[PDB]
Write a protein that binds this ligand. Structure first.
Ligand code: BCL
Ligand code: BCL
Ligand code: BCL
Ligand code: BCL
Ligand code: BCL
Ligand code: BCL
Ligand code: BCL
Ligand code: BCL
Ligand code: BCL
Lengths: 356, 356, 356
C-alpha cells in the first residue's frame, strides 16, 4: 500500500528564550514529481553573531545535489543586518558549480519590506494576525569574474537580450528565472514578481561581469517573507550559533528526507502570559501542495513536543494523544488527518499554547 | 475513517414559477484550511420587491462570524434594479464591525455587463450554453464617516498610497484587496481583475471619507457573475420575499454546515416543453475545489428532489437511484462519485430535465 | 469501487529509425469535468512527405465531436516546412462546422522559436536536459469567405471591438480565446500568452474577411512546443506516411478512450550508444492534472514495450515487472503508483534506456 511514515520532534528552551531543537524525518513510497530523476540533495544553513552591537549575522549556506547523475553545488557566505525596521542589508560571496563548470560571485543587496497598511483596529482585535499584505523591494549589485568561455558566452547573450529586448528584457526574464514549475508556484502563493529593472550591466577589467538590478515581489498575506519580515530574521535572539541541516533522496519509487536544527524563533510570546509554537509558515505548505496530491497515501506519523521543565500545554488543537509531564505526543486520529491535510496543500491551523 | 455526510433537498414550484425550496447539510471530520481556527459563520440574505413597475428590489444581508475568538459582523441594505439589459444600479448602506471596532458606509454603484460576442450560429446550435466570455465594469461611489482614530489613520494611509503610488496604487491594491488565497482564486476561475481607477478621493465636512472608483473584472466563461448576468438576478420572478440562510462551524478536526432557502431561479425553461434544475454555477465548485482535495474521504450522501404535482423527470444523468411519484432520490454509485467530484473542484454536468 | 483500467503498448523500430507503434486504452467509472455532457470526440492526424528536398510535410487533421447533442467538426489540410532551425512556415485551409453552421478558412503562418539562452556549460554537464525556457512568435494571415448572415454578424462585432477597444482589444481577447478553463491552464504549465497585435483587419471583395495578427507565447520549460521545438516536428525521419488516431466517449458516469499511432520520434539517441523512449511531454501531464484529482481511484494497468530484435533494456526506472526476450511489461507496484502520479498531474520521470 502507499504509506507516508514520518516523525517530528520539538524541544523548547524556557525563560527569555524562543529557541528550539527541531527534527523531522519522512519516507514515502511514491515517485517525486521531478522530470529528471534520481535526485538527492543536502542543505546546511548556519547563522552566527558577528557583531551584536550592529546586529550583524554571519549566514552561511551550502547546498549539494545530484540530479540524473549531474553533481551540483552552491556555497554562500553573507553578512546580514537590519538597518531600520523595514530595511535589511546583505554583503556576501559564493560559488555555483555544475559538473565540470564553476563560477564565483560577490554581491551587495538591500531589501526593503513595505506592509500595505498599519491599523490599531486590527492590532487590538486580532490576537494572532496571519495574512499581512505587502510588497518587498530588492536592489542587488553583483560581480562575477568572466574567467572561462562559458561565462563570456552567457554574458554576451545577456548583452544581446538587454540591448535588443529593451522593455521586453525585464518582462520576459521572469520565465527564464522561475524555471519550470517555479513560475506556476508564484500565483499559487498569492505572490507577484515585478519586471526586473536594470540599473547597470557591463564588463570591468581579468574581465568581471558587473550588474545592478531591482525588482519587487508582493503578497496577499500567504508570502511569509513579507508578512513575517522581522520574525524570519530573529537576530535579537541570536546570542550563539544557530544551525539547520536537511537532506533528501528520491527517485521514481520513493522519497526519504531528514531535517534537524537548533535555532531561535521556534516559540513566540502569544500574549496574556502564554507562549505558542510559531505559526506555521504558509508558503512551504502551499508550494508543497503542488506536489502532495499525486498519490493517495495512508499516514503513519508522530509528533513529540518537549516543553521546558515545569511548563505545560494550556491549549492544543488538534489535541495531543498522550502526555507524560512536559512531553506530549500526537499520532493517529485528528493529528494524522491534519498531517495528510498539510502535505496536500492545506493551511488549517494546528495551534499549541503553553505557559509556566 | 474520513467520511463526508451530506443531505440535499429541492422542492419545486410548478406552472409559471421558477421558485424552489432548497436545503443542504454536511458534516466532515477534516480540518478547514483556514490558518486561523476555530471559525464559525452565519449568513442571511433576503430579497423583497420594493417596486415591481421600476423592478426595484430591497436586498438585505447579514454576516456574523467568530474567527480565533474575534467577533465580526457585516450588515448591508441595498436597493437594486436593472436600468437596461446590461446596466444595473445599486444604492445602499451598511456597517462592518470587528471586536471593539465599527464603521458605517453608504454607496451608489453601477455595474455594466459586457458579453464579448453575440452569435445566432451559437444560439441556434447549442441547446444549453455554458461558457460565455465577457467583462463587467464597476463604478462605485462610497462614503464613510471618519468618526474614530482608526478611520482617520487608514484614510491617511490611503492618502499617502494614492498620492505617492501614482500608477502603482491601482495596480498593487489588488493583492491588498484579494487577501490571502482570494488572490490565488482569481486565476483559478479563469477570472481577471483590472487595476483600480481612482476618480475621486477626499475628505468632506464630522469628517467623511469620500471616494469614487472603477474596475472591471472579466471571465473566460466560468465566471457566473458575467456568463449568467440576467439569470443571477431573477427580479421578474420576485412577486414575494425570497430568503436564504447558511451557517458553518469549523475547527482543526471538523466542518459542519447547513443551508436553507426559498427563492426563484431554482428551475429554468430548457426548451421543447422541458424544464431543468438550473445549471450548476461553476465558480463555487472551482473555488471550493481549492480546499476540497486536502483529505481523502468516503461519501455518505442523499439528494431528494420533489417535483410539483403531476410532473415527472424525463431525463436524469447521473440517474436517480429511487422514485415514488414526484419524489426522486440520489445516493451511492454514480451520484456519490459525482458528489466526490464536485467537492474536489470538478464541474461535470449533473442534469435533471422534467415536464408535465 | 472506482477503478482506472488501462493498457499501453510501444513497438519500436531499430537501426537508424526513431519510429514506434504506440497504443493506449483506458476506461474509468468517473464523470468527466465538462459542464456539458455527454461528450464524444474522435481525432485523426496524418503527416506525409510532400517534398523531402525542401522538407515539406502534408499535415492533415480531422476532429469530430458531439457535446450535449451538438455535432461539431474541424477539418484542416496544411503544408509545413522548416525555413531555418528557428523559423517554420505553414500554408493551409480547413473548415469548422457546428450543427447547421459552417465556415471555411485559408491561412499562411510563420512560427519563430526563440530559446532564452544557449550554454555549453549546460550542454556538457546535463545528459538529458528537460526545462528549456523560451518564447515563440506567431505571425498569422487568415481568410474566411463571409458567405452567411452569422459570419457577417461576427465580422461586424470584431470591427466594433477592434476600433472601439483600441489597446484593450489585444489584451481582453485572451479570455475570449482561452474559453473556460483553457485560460486557467495557461499559468498551470508555466506558460504566458502575449496580447494580440492586429496588423490587418478588413473585408475583401463574395465578401471575404481578411486578417493578419501576431502573438507570442512563452514557457519556463514545461511548454514542450518551445522546449522541444525541433523534436516535435521530426521531418528528417518522415520517409513515409505517419498517422495517429484517438477517440473518447464520456458522460457523468464514465470516460473511455483509445489511441493508436505509427510515427517517428518514439525513441531518441540518449548518447553513449544508448537509446531512450522519448522524454514524456510535460504539458499533457500538467493539463490533465487539472482534471485527474476529482475522484479517488484504484489502478489496473499494464504497459508493454517491444524492442527491435536483439535489443535489450539497459536501465528502467520504475523497473519492469516481467520480461521475455525483447518484450517487457510493467504492472502493479511502483509502475501503478507512477500511473496514478502522472494521471493526477505528476511529472516524475519514468525512464527506459535500451541498446544493441
Ligand atoms: C510536506 C510536509 C510539510 C510540513 C509538515 C509539518 C508537520 C506535519 C508538522 C510540522 C511542524 C512544524 N513545521 Mg512544517 N512542514 C513543511 C515545511 C516547513 C518549513 C519549510 C521552510 O519548508 C518550515 C519553516 C516549517 C516549520 C514548522 C514549525 C511551524 C513546526 C515545528 C517544526 C517541525 O516539527 O518540523 C518538522 C520537519 C519537517 C516536516 C520537515 C519539512 C522539510 C521541508 C519539506 C523542506 C525540505 C527541504 C530539503 C531538505 C532541501 C530543499 C533544497 C532545494 C531543492 C534547493 N515547516 C513541509 C512542506 N510541519 C509541526 C507542528 O505544527 O508543530 C506545532 C508538525 O506537526
Ligand atoms: C524567498 C522569497 C523572496 C525573497 C525574500 C527575501 C528575504 C525575506 C530576505 C532576502 C534576502 C536577500 N535576498 Mg531575496 N528573496 C527572493 C529572491 C531573491 C533572488 C533571486 C535571484 O531570486 C536574489 C538574488 C535575492 C537576493 C537577496 C540578497 C540581497 C539577500 C540575502 C540572500 C542570501 O544571503 O541568500 C543565501 C541563502 C540561501 C542560499 C538559502 C536560503 C534558504 C531559505 C530561503 C532559508 C529559510 C530559513 C530556514 C527555514 C531556517 C534557517 C535557520 C538557520 C539557523 C539560519 N533574493 C524571493 C522573491 N530575500 C535577505 C537579506 O538579507 O536582505 C538584505 C532577507 O532578509
Ligand atoms: C542571482 C543569480 C546568480 C547565479 C546563479 C546561477 C545558477 C544557480 C546557475 C547559474 C548558471 C550559469 N550562470 Mg550564473 N548566476 C549569477 C551570475 C552570473 C553572471 C554574471 C556576470 O553576473 C554570469 C555571466 C553567469 C553565467 C552563467 C552561465 C555560464 C551558467 C549556465 C547558463 C545559465 O543558466 O545561466 C543562468 C544565469 C543567471 C542565473 C544570471 C546571469 C546574470 C546576467 C549575466 C547579468 C544580470 C542580468 C539581469 C540584470 C539580472 C538577472 C537575474 C537572474 C535572472 C536571477 N551567471 C548570480 C551570482 N547561475 C547555471 C549553471 O551552472 O549551469 C551549468 C546554474 O545552474
Ligand atoms: C462543497 C459542495 C459544493 C456543492 C455541491 C452540491 C451537490 C452535491 C449538489 C448541489 C446541488 C445544487 N447546488 Mg451546489 N455546491 C456548492 C455550492 C453552490 C452554490 C454557492 C453559491 O456556493 C450554489 C448557488 C449552488 C447551487 C446548487 C443548485 C444548482 C443545486 C440545487 C441546490 C442544492 O441542492 O443545494 C444544496 C446545498 C449545498 C451543497 C450547500 C453549499 C454551501 C456552499 C458551500 C456555500 C456555503 C457558504 C457559507 C454558509 C457562508 C460563507 C460566508 C463567507 C465566508 C463570508 N451550489 C458547494 C461548493 N450542490 C444539487 C444538484 O446538482 O441538484 C441538481 C446537488 O446534488
Ligand atoms: C462576485 C464577482 C464580482 C462581482 C459581481 C457582481 C454582480 C453580478 C453584481 C454586483 C453588484 C454590485 N457590486 Mg460587485 N462583484 C465583485 C466585487 C465587488 C466589490 C469588491 C470590493 O470586491 C464591491 C465593493 C462591489 C460592489 C457592488 C455594488 C455596486 C453592487 C451591489 C453589491 C451589494 O449589494 O452587495 C451586498 C451583498 C452581500 C454582502 C452578499 C452577497 C453574497 C453573494 C455574492 C450572493 C450570491 C447569491 C446567493 C447564491 C443567493 C441569494 C438569494 C437571496 C434570496 C437573494 N462588487 C466581484 C469582482 N457585483 C450587483 C448590483 O446590484 O450591481 C448594480 C450585481 O448585480
Ligand atoms: C468596499 C470596501 C468597504 C470596506 C470593507 C471593510 C472590511 C470588510 C474591513 C474593513 C476594515 C477597515 N476599514 Mg473599511 N471598507 C470600506 C471603506 C473604508 C474607508 C473609507 C473612507 O471609505 C475607510 C477609511 C475604511 C477603514 C478601515 C480600517 C479602519 C479598518 C482596518 C484596516 C483595513 O483592513 O482597512 C481595509 C480598508 C478597506 C477595505 C477600504 C478603504 C477605502 C479607502 C480609504 C478609500 C478608497 C480607496 C480606493 C479608491 C478603493 C479601494 C477598494 C478596496 C481595496 C476594496 N474603510 C468600504 C465601505 N473595511 C477591517 C476591519 O474592520 O478591521 C478591524 C475589515 O475587516
Ligand atoms: C491521463 C494519462 C496521461 C498519460 C499517461 C501515460 C502512461 C501511464 C504512459 C504513457 C506513456 C507515454 N506517453 Mg503519455 N499520457 C498522457 C498524454 C500524452 C501525450 C499527449 C499529446 O497528450 C503524449 C504525446 C504522450 C506521450 C507518451 C510517450 C512519452 C510514452 C509512450 C506512448 C504511450 O504509451 O502512450 C499511451 C497512450 C496514452 C496514455 C493515451 C493518452 C491520450 C491523451 C490523454 C490525449 C487524448 C486526446 C483525445 C483522444 C482527443 C482530444 C481532442 C480535443 C478535445 C479537441 N502522452 C495523458 C495526459 N503516458 C508510457 C511511457 O511512459 O512509456 C515509457 C506510459 O507508461
Ligand atoms: C500548442 C502550443 C502553442 C502553439 C504551438 C505551435 C507549434 C509548436 C507549431 C505551431 C504551428 C502553427 N500554429 Mg501555433 N500554437 C498555439 C496556438 C495557435 C493558434 C490559436 C488560435 O490558438 C493558432 C491559430 C495557431 C496557428 C499556427 C499555424 C501558423 C501553424 C500550423 C497549425 C496547424 O496546422 O494546426 C493544425 C493542427 C491541428 C488542428 C491538430 C494539432 C493537435 C496537436 C497540437 C498535435 C500534437 C502532435 C501529436 C501529439 C502527434 C501527431 C503525429 C502525427 C503522426 C503527425 N497556433 C499555442 C499557443 N503552433 C506549427 C507550424 O507549422 O508553424 C509554422 C508548429 O510547428
Ligand atoms: C484561428 C481561429 C479560426 C476559427 C475558429 C473557430 C472555431 C473553433 C469556432 C468558430 C466559430 C465562429 N466563428 Mg470562426 N475561426 C476563424 C475565423 C473566423 C472569421 C474570420 C473572418 O476570420 C469569422 C468572421 C469567424 C466567425 C465565427 C462565428 C460566426 C462563429 C460563432 C462565434 C464564435 O465563437 O466566433 C469565434 C471567432 C473566432 C475564433 C475568430 C474570429 C476572427 C476575427 C473575425 C478576425 C481576426 C480577429 C483578431 C485579429 C484575431 C483573433 C484570434 C482568435 C481569438 C483565436 N471566424 C479562424 C479560421 N471559429 C464557432 C462556431 O462555429 O460556433 C457555432 C466555433 O466553435
Amino acid at each position: 500500500t502507499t504509506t507516508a511514515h514520518s516523525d517530528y520532534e520539538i524541544i523548547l528552551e524556557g525563560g527569555s528564550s524562543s529557541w528550539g531543537q527541531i527534527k523531522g524525518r519522512a519516507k514515502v513510497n511514491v515517485p517525486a514529481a521531478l522530470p529528471l530523476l534520481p535526485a538527492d540533495c543536502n542543505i546546511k544553513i548556519e547563522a552566527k553573531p558577528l557583531d551584536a552591537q550592529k546586529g550583524v549575522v554571519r549566514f552561511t549556506s551550502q547546498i549539494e545535489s545530484i540530479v540524473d547523475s549531474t553533481k551540483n553545488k552552491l556555497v554562500v557566505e553573507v553578512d546580514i543586518a537590519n538597518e531600520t525596521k523595514d530595511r535589511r542589508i546583505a554583503v556576501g560571496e559564493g560559488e555555483v558549480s555544475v559538473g565540470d563548470f564553476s563560477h564565483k560571485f560577490s554581491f551587495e543587496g538591500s531589501v526593503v519590506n513595505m506592509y500595505y497598511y498599519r491599523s490599531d483596529a486590527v492590532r487590538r482585535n486580532v490576537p494572532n494576525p496571519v495574512y499581512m499584505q505587502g510588497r518587498q523591494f530588492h536592489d542587488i549589485m553583483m560581480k562575477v569574474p568572466l574567467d572561462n568561455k562559458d561565462l563570456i558566452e552567457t554574458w554576451e547573450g545577456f548583452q544581446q537580450s538587454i540591448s535588443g529586448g529593451g522593455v521586453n528584457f525585464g518582462d520576459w526574464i521572469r520565465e527564464f528565472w522561475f524555471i519550470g514549475p517555479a513560475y506556476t508556484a508564484i500565483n499559487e502563493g498569492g505572490q507577484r514578481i515585478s519586471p526586473i529593472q536594470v540599473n547597470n550591466f557591463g564588463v570591468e577589467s581579468g574581465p568581471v561581469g558587473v550588474s545592478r538590478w531591482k525588482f519587487s515581489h508582493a503578497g496577499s498575506g500567504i508570502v511569509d517573507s513579507i508578512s513575517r519580515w522581522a520574525e524570519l530574521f530573529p537576530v535579537e535572539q541570536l546570542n550563539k550559533p544557530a544551525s539547520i541541516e536537511g537532506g533528501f533522496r528520491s527517485d521514481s519509487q520513493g522519497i526519504e528526507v531528514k531535517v534537524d536544527g537548533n535555532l531561535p524563533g521556534v516559540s513566540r510570546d502569544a500574549g496574556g502570559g502564554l507562549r505558542r509554537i510559531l505559526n506555521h509558515p504558509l508558503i512551504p505548505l502551499v508550494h508543497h501542495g503542488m506536489v502532495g496530491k499525486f498519490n493517495d497515501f495512508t499516514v503513519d506519523t508522530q509528533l513529540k513536543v518537549v516543553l521546558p521543565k515545569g511548563y505545560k500545554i494550556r491549549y492544543a488543537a488538534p489535541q495531543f494523544r498522550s502526555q507524560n509531564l512536559e512531553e506530549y505526543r500526537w499520532s493517529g486520529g485528528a493529528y494524522a488527518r491534519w498531517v495528510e491535510h498539510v502535505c496536500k496543500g492545506g493551511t488549517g491551523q494546528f495551534e499549541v499554547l503553553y505557559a509556566q
